[PDB]
């Protein structure tokens, strides 16, 4: 199966710095972007337009980095450079709750299962996690430098006995955490940049993280070990497993590579033309996610555009 | 005297012609260089290549007489020496200065980059000009490589060779690097070839 | 004009020569960093600094320039400078030698292999 | 500029002599960086951080609890 052209999505002014989609309507998408705001889009299955937004949110004042969607599709939350975050519905805009307290930016928000708490990791070198009502209710400290991006684990189990989440900073390590005794349980070394992007699989049990050199090295957070690294030569920016089928799919910088792990070689080296851009350096994705099917891939590019590739 | 062991071996007769050593400067021709030999036609002239194997025998006899070895200093500012005198920095103590020699190097004590040194060895006299003038502020020997048309103005020992060449350069400070650490001990056999490569000491041009 | 002073220059300069594996082609990363990693009394300095360093990474990627050295460039440029190649270029290949270069080496007395060629105006 | 009215006292002085009258102008210039009030140095002066330095780690280790 190749993925091909579908369309692009024109709907903002800056780099698409997150995507996000929710199993509740595979007709949904959201998209935080560089201009402050966040852009939720209707799709409708056709040729190159795929459809129209439906709510564009507003309130943020700095670069919205990261953007998230809930399981039931209307609640949405936005990590943002002003040093809070907001909750927002898909129904009418409508912030229900900021969340301040953060001394500096916020790179990554995540929202746990059945919509307990969601975590936080900032540019102050600490992971906040807050209830809904904005209180934080902990504090989580032990970063050198500060955080680039985290996440939580997805439990294959429906609740088995807890929850756990994982860290990625500039400092070529990665902290596996367990909110529910606010501890550390692993350090995960051997990275040699600074790490800018990390993704679990939906197993929940395989994790890839990946940095400035452009490495894509692999964990198993189950077993607490290291089984292999593989190379994309360029920097690479962000990270997407497929929920359904195993991929994993890479931002470079050159443009994406896809990844079938199981015999581990390339697939097709996704290289969209934009009509120009020769000069300078080409336009290339900074966020992407796999769709709740799994059969439609979206990236977002700085050209302000976010393109979709589905497999036929 | 010498333990006549020292003299011109067959094999680096042949690094010295296939380096092309022996073909010097044009017509013109300095009184100061006796070491002209057999002017060939198309105006050439032909460098006794056994009399630079004495000079090169006597001046690294001067570079092994100082006590400390990091006082040295090897100046090329030619574009085909910067890694003849870089590399000969490493083999010997030999503190060098490849590129602009920033003068006040040798006058001006509170320079950033003041060395005294108490010998300097440079590629090309006329090339290194601030070099050799310097060196005569401060009361100090000097050892050029030198054609038959270079000015040996305030110039000592003198090893002649064309510093037109490209292999020349590269051949006459490997061969100068060969001597001083044989007589000071980095080597122990006299007729060892040396085994790292003579290639070392050539410039690239990308 | 938009020319940038020395200091804005030098400020540059040092945070290249010092944080090659940090900050990227993108402003508003290096904004925020580079307010932090260096103690600039001014945010119109800050970002002008900021600026000239992006504008370096774009010079950086395309060839080496002038004046920069940083932790990944020395140690290149010596692993290029320890060429050791086996084709010995100095050996022989097969020497030529002219009429006047023959005399030179039976007059010295060593034996070695001459091709004598003719050379004349 | 700015730092001059921050980093620099000024007095002037009218002393009596018996052919006239002399003037006196002192101004002295502090160390700005024992300022202990307001700013700490100069607008145009940069401080650059100096890292700490670390060896690559070389293999891919797993440190646990
Ligand atoms: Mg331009």
């Not at chain 1, 299962?113 to 504090?139: E, H, N, Y």
């Not at chain 2, 490493?90 to 020699?101: K, L, W």
């Not at chain 2, 051949?171 to 001083?180: C, K």
């Not at chain 3, 100095?90 to 030698?97: A, E, F, P, Q, W």
Request: charged share 25%; hydrophobic share 40%.
């Amino acid at each position: 199966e190749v993925l091909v052209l579908r369309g692009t999505l024109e709907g903002h002014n800056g780099w698409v710095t997150s995507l996000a989609t929710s199993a509740g309507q595979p007709n949904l998408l959201l998209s935080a972007s560089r201009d402050k705001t966040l852009i939720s889009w209707k799709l409708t299955g056709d040729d190159q337009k795929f459809g129209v937004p439906v709510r564009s949110f507003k309130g943020h004042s700095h670069i919205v980095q990261d953007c998230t969607l809930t399981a039931d599709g209307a609640y949405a939350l936005s990590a943002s450079w002003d040093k809070t975050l907001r909750l927002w519905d898909v129904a009418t805009g409508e912030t229900y709750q900021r969340f301040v307290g953060h001394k500096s930016d916020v790179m990554s928000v995540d929202i746990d299962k059945k919509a307990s708490m969601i975590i936080s990791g900032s540019r102050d070198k600490t992971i906040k996690v807050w209830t809904i009502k904005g209180q934080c209710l902990a504090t989580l400290l032990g970063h050198n430098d500060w955080v680039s991006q985290v996440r939580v684990v997805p439990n294959e189990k429906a609740d088995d006995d807890s929850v756990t989440i994982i860290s990625a900073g500039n400092d070529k390590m990665v902290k596996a955490w367990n909110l529910n005794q606010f501890q550390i349980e692993a350090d995960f070394i051997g990275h040699n940049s600074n790490i800018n992007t990390l993704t679990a699989s939906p197993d929940g049990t395989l994790i890839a993280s990946a940095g400035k050199d452009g490495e894509i090295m692999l964990w198993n957070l189950a077993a607490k070990k290291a089984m292999y690294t593989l190379s994309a030569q360029d920097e690479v920016f962000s990270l997407a497993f497929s929920p359904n089928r195993y991929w994993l799919a890479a931002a470079t910088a050159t443009g994406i590579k896809v990844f079938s792990l199981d015999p581990q070689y390339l697939v097709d080296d996704l290289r969209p033309e934009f009509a120009g851009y020769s000069k300078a350096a080409e336009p290339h994705a900074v966020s992407l996610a796999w769709s709740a099917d799994g059969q439609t891939l979206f990236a977002g590019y700085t050209d302000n555009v976010i393109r979709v590739w589905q497999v036929m | 005297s010498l333990p006549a062991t020292f003299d011109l071996t067959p094999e680096d007769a042949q690094l010295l012609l296939a380096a092309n050593t022996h073909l010097g400067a044009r017509n013109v021709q300095v009184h100061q260089e006796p070491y002209v030999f057999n002017a060939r036609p198309d105006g050439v002239h032909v460098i006794n290549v056994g009399k630079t194997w004495e000079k090169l025998v006597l001046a690294a006899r001067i570079i092994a007489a100082i006590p400390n070895p990091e006082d040295v200093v090897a100046i090329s500012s030619r574009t085909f020496g910067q890694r003849a005198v870089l590399k000969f920095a490493a083999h010997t103590g030999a503190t060098p200065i490849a590129g602009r020699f920033t003068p006040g190097s040798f006058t001006n004590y509170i320079t950033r980059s003041f060395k005294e040194p108490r010998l300097v060895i440079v590629t090309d006299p006329r090339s290194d000009a601030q070099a050799i003038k310097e060196a005569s502020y401060v009361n100090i020997p000097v050892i050029a490589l030198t054609d038959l048309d270079s000015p040996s103005e305030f110039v000592d020992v003198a090893i002649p060779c064309n510093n037109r060449g490209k292999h020349s350069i590269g051949l006459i400070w490997y061969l100068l690097a060969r001597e001083v650490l044989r007589l000071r001990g980095a080597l122990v056999d006299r007729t060892q070839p040396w085994s790292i490569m003579p290639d070392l000491y050539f410039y690239r041009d990308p | 004009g938009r020319v940038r002073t020395k200091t804005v220059k030098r400020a540059s300069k040092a945070l290249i020569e010092r944080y090659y594996p940090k900050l990227t082609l993108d402003f508003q990363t290096n904004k925020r960093l580079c307010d932090e990693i260096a103690t600039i009394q001014s945010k119109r300095l800050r970002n002008k600094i900021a600026g000239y360093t992006t504008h370096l990474m774009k010079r950086i990627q395309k060839g080496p320039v002038r004046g920069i050295s940083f932790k990944l460039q020395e140690e290149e440029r010596e692993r290029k400078d320890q060429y050791v190649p086996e084709v010995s270029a100095l050996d022989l290949s097969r020497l030529n030698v002219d009429n006047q270069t023959s005399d030179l080496v039976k007059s010295l007395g060593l034996k070695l292999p001459l091709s004598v060629i003719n050379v004349s105006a | 500029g700015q730092p001059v009215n921050d980093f620099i006292d000024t007095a002037t002085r009218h002393v009596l002599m018996r052919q006239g009258v002399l003037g006196i102008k002192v101004k002295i210039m502090r160390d700005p960086a024992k300022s202990r009030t307001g700013p700490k140095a100069l607008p145009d002066a940069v401080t650059i951080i100096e890292p700490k330095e670390e060896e690559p780690i070389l293999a891919p280790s797993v440190k646990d609890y």
